[PDB]
Design a protein around this nucleic acid. Structure first.
Ligand SMILES: [Zn+2]
Ligand SMILES: [Zn+2]
Ligand SMILES: [Zn+2]
Ligand SMILES: [Zn+2]
Lengths: 87, 78
DNA sequence: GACAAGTGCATTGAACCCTT
DNA sequence: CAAGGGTTCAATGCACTTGT
């Protein structure tokens, strides 16, 4: 029945649960980078893009909004654990 | 106004003989310049469109060729 | 192990420049 | 100006390494 595990953000093939959501490697990295830079994006369309494999590279605002809506947890990106006091 | 004949993204004009997007232009250029050969990890009939054109470099390159793109229109590096 | 978090870096493509 | 050659380089995403 499950023929392909699906990224909840963009529908590409999911690689695993990242920051608490089933997502692809693209969305994982996009989310991590967005969060570590505290990026604020501005949609140059109508603030309501449907995410897919094409619209994920075209609208960062709507992609990040979707990441969060699907349950990606930004407090889990490089939290203040022993491992970070490392790097 | 035109569409990329390879993938259906918006064309930026003709490139190397065919209406094509900046993506497919860029990809064909790199492929020819470096003389790269790809291998398909399926059956050499993968979907190449605006959504998943990056999943198969072999199939994308073959489709640039079947659409009319000419290796000879790629110049030497400047 | 197997997974998820973090990293390295080659590839992508939108936005430029150049010459006809 | 436009087209169709060129180039650039931040963002991207595949493959990897690290930690449990
Ligand atoms: Zn995704
Ligand atoms: Zn948007
Ligand atoms: Zn194209
Ligand atoms: Zn293929």
């Amino acid at each position: 029945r499950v023929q392909e595990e699906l990224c909840l953000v963009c529908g590409d093939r999911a690689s695993g649960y990242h920051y608490n959501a089933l997502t692809c490697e693209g969305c994982k990295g996009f989310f991590r980078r967005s969060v570590t830079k505290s990026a604020v994006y501005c949609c140059k369309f109508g603030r309501a893009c449907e995410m897919d494999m094409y619209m994920r590279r075209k609208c960062q605002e709507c992609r990040l909004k979707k990441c969060l809506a699907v349950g990606m947890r930004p407090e889990c990106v490089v939290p203040e654990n022993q491992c970070a006091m490392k790097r | 106004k035109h569409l990329c004949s390879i993938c259906g993204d918006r064309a930026s004009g003709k490139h190397y003989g065919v209406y094509s997007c900046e993506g497919c232009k860029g990809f064909f250029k790199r492929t020819v310049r470096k003389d790269l050969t790809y291998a398909c990890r399926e059956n050499r009939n993968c979907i190449i469109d605006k959504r998943q054109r990056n999943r198969c470099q072999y199939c994308r390159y073959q489709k640039c060729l079947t659409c009319g793109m000419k290796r000879e229109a790629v110049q030497e590096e400047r």
